[model samples]
Target: SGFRKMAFPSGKVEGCMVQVTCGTTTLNGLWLDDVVYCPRHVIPNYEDLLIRKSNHNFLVQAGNVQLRVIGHSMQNCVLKLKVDTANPKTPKYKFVRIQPGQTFSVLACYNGSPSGVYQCAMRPNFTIKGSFLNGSCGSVGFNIDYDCVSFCYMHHMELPTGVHAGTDLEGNFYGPFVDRQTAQAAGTDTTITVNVLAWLYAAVINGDRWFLNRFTTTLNDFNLVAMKYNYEPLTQDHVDILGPLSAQTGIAVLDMCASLKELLQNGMNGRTILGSALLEDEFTPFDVVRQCSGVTF
Candidate 1:
C-alpha cells in the first residue's frame, strides 16, 4: 500500500514532478522511479480530491506525462482514477504508473453529511467504493507491499436471499440490525444475504454463527455452507487458528464477503486476527478466484 516500484512498460528510473490544484489549494509531489514522494505534511486531502462539476480541477505533470483533469462529482461514495472502457465520457488513458501510499482513504457519507471520510489502510475491502481493497484482513502494507495490494481479500462470493432459509432466531441478527422484529424479518432468508458480508464476519471470527444455525439444514447440504461458515470463536483459544484457516484456498471469498462489521468486530469488539505477511508471488494462486468471484452474483 505504500511507495513501491510499479512495473511499467518503459521501466525507466527518472524524476517526475507532479503538481495538483483544486480551488485555492495547490499540492505538489516528486515521483522518482515509481514512488511519489510528497511533502511530509502533504497528506492527500479527500475534499481536495473531490471531483466537482465545473470548479474542481487538477494538473499532473510527471516527466513527459501531463494531464489536465476536469470532471463532475458523482453521487457515488468512492474515489476512482477513471478508466476509459466503461467510462466513455472520460479519456481513455491507462495509468502508466499508479502509486498509492501506506495510508489511503474513501469518501463516505454518515448522518447524511457528505463529508464523511475514513481510512482504508488495514481494513480489508472496507467496501466504500462498493468493492474491496487489499489489506490482510488488518495487515495492509507489510504483506506483499505494492502500490495496490490485491492479495488481502482476494476471495469472495455472494448468496441470494433464498439460499439461507429458515425460521430466523434472535441471535442470528448482529451488527447493523438492532430491533428484534426487524432483525427477524430481515434475517428470515430475506435480507441478511443482502448484507451477507457483514453477517459472515460475525459468524466466523466472532462466533456469532447462530444465523448459520438457522439456515435450513436441507439447503446447506453442500460443501459451501460447511467449508465457508465452519464457525469458531477466536477469543477463547490463544493460538492463531484463524490465521492458518485464513490461508486456506477459498478464504478470501469469505473475507471479502464481509461488510463494515468486519472493521467493527475486529477493532471495536476486540476479535482481532493478525495475518502473516504474504509475498507478491503468493497472490498468484488466487488469480482464478479473483476472476470468477465478484461477477457470479
Candidate 2:
C-alpha cells in the first residue's frame, strides 16, 4: 500500500511521495492520479510499463521507452502525446494525435536510439481548446511499453533517418520531418512518398513562421478553387475567412482537406514534400483545386 500525491504537468510536485515495503525489501515510488511510478532497475535490454488514464493533467518521466499508445474513449477522443527530448535546458518535443479505439506506436527511431520522456496532452474532439491544467471531457490513456533496442526496429517499413516521429490531427504517421535538401540527399526519389502529416504538424509546432504562413496561403488558394466549382469548402464563407487560416487553426482545417491521405501515394516532389498536392486521379488545375476544395487551409 502507498499514499497519494498530486502531479503537475511542468514536472513539479505538490504532494508527498509513496513507499511500498515488505519486510526486508522496500520499493520506492510515487502514486499519482493515473499511474504508479516505481523506479525500475535500468535493465540493459528493455522495460515495460502501462500508463493508465490520466485523470488530471499530469506529467510522468517515462525514461527511454518505446510507446504503444492505445485510445480508450467511449467515442473518438483526441489524444495528444508530447514526447520530450532528453535535454534539460532546451527540451524538444514531438507531438502525436490519436483517435479512440486506435493504437499509435512509436515504432520509429530517434537518431537511431529510442530515448525520451513522453507526456500526454489530451482533449475531446468536440472542443477546440485543450487543457493541461485539469481534466476535461473523456480521458486519453497511454500504454507505455519501454523498449531498449540497440537499433530501430520496424518490419516492412522504411523509418525516417531523422530523430523524431509524430502524427497530425488526422492520425496520419510521419517522422523525422526533413527538408527537401536532406530528403533528396538521402536519395529519396519520386517513387517514395513524402510524410505530409508530419510536415503539417511540423509547420504548426516547430517549423518557421514563414513556412506556416505559406501553408496557410496555399490552403486559401485551394479554398478559392473549390468555391469556383459547385462543391463547398469546409471553412465557413466570410470576408474574414483569412483570419482562421492562420497557423493557429491550420491543422484543424488541413485535416478537412480530402486530399491529405492521397499525398501518401504521390511522388516525393516539391508539392508532395510540402503536403501540397492535387487531388487523386485529378491532373488539371480546376480538378486539383476542386478536389482540395474542402480543406479550410
TM-score of each: 0.22, 0.22
**Reference-based TM-score, model 2:** 0.22
Candidate 2 lDDT over residue span 265-293, tens digit each: 34334543223443221121111222233
- Report the Cα lDDT for residue 77, model 1: 20
Give the per-residue lDDT of model 1 (tens digit) for 1-297.
Answer: 121212221111111224433344334432322332222111134356442323224343443455443332321121222211121122112222111111222222111112222332211112111222211111111122223222111111111321111111111111122211232222211111212232233234433332222112221232233234322112212113223334432344334323222333333243322121211111111221222232221
In model 2, where do residues sit more than 4 Å from their true spots?
1-15, 29-117, 120-202, 205-259, 266-297
Per-model C-alpha lDDT, please? 0.24, 0.25
- Write down the TM-score for model 1: 0.22
Worst 10 residues of 1 by lDDT: 162-171
Flag clash pairs in model 1: 125-133, 155-252, 155-253, 156-253, 197-257, 197-258
Error of 2 at 119 (Å): 1.9
Write down the worst ten-residue block by lDDT for model 2. 148-157
